[PDB]
Amino acid sequence: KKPHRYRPGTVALREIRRYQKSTELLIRKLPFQRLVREIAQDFKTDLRFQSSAVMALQEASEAYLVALFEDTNLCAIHAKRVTIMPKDIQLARRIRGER
Amino acid sequence: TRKESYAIYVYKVLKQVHPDTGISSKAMSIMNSFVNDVFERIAGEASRLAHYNKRSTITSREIQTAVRLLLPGELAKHAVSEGTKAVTKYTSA
Amino acid sequence: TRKESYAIYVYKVLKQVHPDTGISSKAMSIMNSFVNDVFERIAGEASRLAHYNKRSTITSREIQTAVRLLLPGELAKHAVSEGTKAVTKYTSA
Amino acid sequence: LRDNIQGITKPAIRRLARRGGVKRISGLIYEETRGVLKVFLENVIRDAVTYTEHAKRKTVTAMDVVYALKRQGRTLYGFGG
Amino acid sequence: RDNIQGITKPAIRRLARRGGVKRISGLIYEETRGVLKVFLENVIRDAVTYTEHAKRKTVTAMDVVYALKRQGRTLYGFG
Amino acid sequence: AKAKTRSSRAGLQFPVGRVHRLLRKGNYAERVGAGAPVYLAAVLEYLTAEILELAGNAARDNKKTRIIPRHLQLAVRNDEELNKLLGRVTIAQGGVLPNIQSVLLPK
Amino acid sequence: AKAKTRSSRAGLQFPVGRVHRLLRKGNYAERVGAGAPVYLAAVLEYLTAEILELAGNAARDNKKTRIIPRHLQLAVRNDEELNKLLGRVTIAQGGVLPNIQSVLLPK
DNA sequence: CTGGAGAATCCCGGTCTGCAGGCCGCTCAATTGGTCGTAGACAGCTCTAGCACCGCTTAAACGCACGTACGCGCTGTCCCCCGC
């Protein structure tokens, strides 16, 4: 009569393995399209969009985010830590040249 | 032979903004390098744009778009204003 | 209208090296884009080489130089060998 | 169109980090991720709209996105070429 | 022949100081030597390529300028 | 005599004539040399052969008869020189290399 | 009639004729618009004036009558938009901005 | 060490289906042949700078003594992120 729960972290490793083998998008399509159109609203009104364009933005953004996450993980590990801190992201972006 | 540069024009611009400030040779060499760099960047972007729209002519609109793409914010706005004013003045003249 | 691509030649090469291997449309487009990008890189580098040397022609020597500049090590050497072999064969025949 | 950046839910960023090889994640990360993503999207969309307008068009094509990504040093294959 | 040892530790320390570095480990110097060597190969290879394509035997500064430019490191003040 | 394609003359799979046309239409120079398009076509063909060979090896390793973007990404990233060449390229639906840092492994 | 410079007609200091000639010989497009070199020269002149003003300010702050590469570097790095524009540009003998991290300061 | 237990994953048939690839008609872009103009290949000339050498001079690198603070290991606390 025990809940039989897994230890903290093994599930994280399992999902890391799961998501490092797949290739599909990880973000819901409709919210991403809504955000993209909202951002584009500030540059020109009544703008129409090809669907292939929105897929292109989604792919590029997810790839860039994965790269940034990988760099941030290295930065945090350099601090002998296991959890990711925003300071790691800031340092990584600064080193990349984005800051 | 003779090699052309931007020394005289940069000198005149300097005398317009700072009518008393001198300049060294290394500085104006850097000036000419910077001018050439910007020229090549804008011209290449304009050529890319013209090829993008299947057109054989490079007009001032292409340069305006290229400047908007290459310069950040306020610099782009001010440069657009300068180019528009110069074009209008030359056409009127 | 009609758009052209490198699809047939890519499929030919695929059958040459892996005669029993198919390919999806998306991957096929990926190779098409890759070939286009490499074409642009080599062409731009060759154009810069010609302009630097004040030349009117893009010859195979410029192509070889651009290949050396843009390719890493063994890729560059093998590509140079392949290009020289193809040029020799075409010249002879 | 207001309050869409909240559309990127915490599980989505979690999945993104898991694909990024991240095992333990702080709770005060997600808003930073959203801000950075917003900056990147703004930077790309600005140039994409510039390209679309220079062509005197009213719809944004994927090919415009391709040019915008290329000019920012992030080349993407498989979207027209 | 060990010109890589021509890069003495005072010069490395000076460069670190201009870089705003206060405390330096002893293992740093050889690491800098290696990284600088790698950078030098990367630049010089392209420089020699340009010199050869021009069918010349003397490397010009403009060759170095082009090599740096094509590597994403633009340099001014030399042409 | 009957027309003989320059690709066949040089024994290549890629269209040398189309390459020459693109070279002339790219505003790259005033005039285009005779052998340059052949050289470029040969180089493109060789690189295509390299990437296709690696992708086919990967797809067979995954035990599929068609090459998908995942196999392309695996082939490009696993090769040192190909990854070096395509260092700044994003492959749609390419996924990531299954790499995990050692420190996060359960000990 | 007497020759009048196109720069004077546009009220510019940058040589519009030289710009147009370089555009023609730069292999950018088959045809060049008449209003193109004027626009390009105007943009170049504006940017030159901006950075020259900043460099003159820096040189005056150093009580020097001539702008040196150090002044140019200081002006470029201090101006946010200018620094972003020349992000990957290295200036010879420009030095670096004097900046020291807080944690290294004595406490 | 070490069986059980439970959850997670793999695998092997069995079924369906969209597209990969082959086939076909056509057409326009590649080809062939001939003209002509001119870019650069080539030989030749000049003289600049790049290489080498030598002798002083002295600032900088080097070696070393010495001392201290900091990177690192260790420990206890709590809170906050993960598994559900």
Curated annotation (Swiss-Prot), chains B, C:
There is a cross-link at residue 89 (Glycyl lysine isopeptide (Lys-Gly) (interchain with G-Cter in ubiquitin)). Keywords: Acetylation, Chromosome, DNA-binding, Glycoprotein, Isopeptide bond, Nucleosome core, Nucleus, Phosphoprotein, Ubl conjugation. Glycans are attached at residue 81. The nucleosome is a histone octamer containing two molecules each of H2A, H2B, H3 and H4 assembled in one H3-H4 heterotetramer and two H2A-H2B heterodimers. The octamer wraps approximately 147 bp of DNA. Belongs to the histone H2B family. Core component of nucleosome. Nucleosomes wrap and compact DNA into chromatin, limiting DNA accessibility to the cellular machineries which require DNA as a template. Histones thereby play a central role in transcription regulation, DNA repair, DNA replication and chromosomal stability. DNA accessibility is regulated via a complex set of post-translational modifications of histones, also called histone code, and nucleosome remodeling. This is Histone H2B 1.1. The chain holds residues 33 to 125 of 126 of the full protein.
UniProtKB/Swiss-Prot annotation, chain D:
One of its GO terms (biological process) is nucleosome assembly. The modification N6-acetyllysine is found at residues 10, 38, 58, 70. Demethylation is performed by JMJD6. There is a cross-link at residue 10 (Glycyl lysine isopeptide (Lys-Gly) (interchain with G-Cter in UFM1)). The modification Phosphoserine is found at residue 26. The chain holds residues 23 to 103 of 103 of the full protein. This is Histone H4. The modification Phosphotyrosine is found at residues 30, 67. One of its GO terms (cellular component) is nucleus. The modification N6-propionyllysine is found at residues 10, 23, 56, 58, 70. The modification N6-(2-hydroxyisobutyryl)lysine is found at residues 10, 23, 38, 56, 58, 70. The modification N6-glutaryllysine is found at residues 10, 38, 56, 58, 70. Core component of nucleosome. Nucleosomes wrap and compact DNA into chromatin, limiting DNA accessibility to the cellular machineries which require DNA as a template. Histones thereby play a central role in transcription regulation, DNA repair, DNA replication and chromosomal stability. DNA accessibility is regulated via a complex set of post-translational modifications of histones, also called histone code, and nucleosome remodeling. It is found in: Nucleus; Chromosome. The modification N6-butyryllysine is found at residues 10, 23, 56, 58, 70. It comes from the Eukaryota. Keywords: Acetylation, Chromosome, Citrullination, DNA-binding, Hydroxylation, Isopeptide bond, Methylation, Nucleosome core, Nucleus, Phosphoprotein, Ubl conjugation. The nucleosome is a histone octamer containing two molecules each of H2A, H2B, H3 and H4 assembled in one H3-H4 heterotetramer and two H2A-H2B heterodimers. The octamer wraps approximately 147 bp of DNA. One of its GO terms (molecular function) is structural constituent of chromatin. The modification N6-succinyllysine is found at residues 10, 56, 70. Belongs to the histone H4 family. There is a cross-link at residue 70 (Glycyl lysine isopeptide (Lys-Gly) (interchain with G-Cter in ubiquitin)). The modification N6-lactoyllysine is found at residues 10, 56, 70. Disulfide bonds: none annotated. It comes from Xenopus laevis.
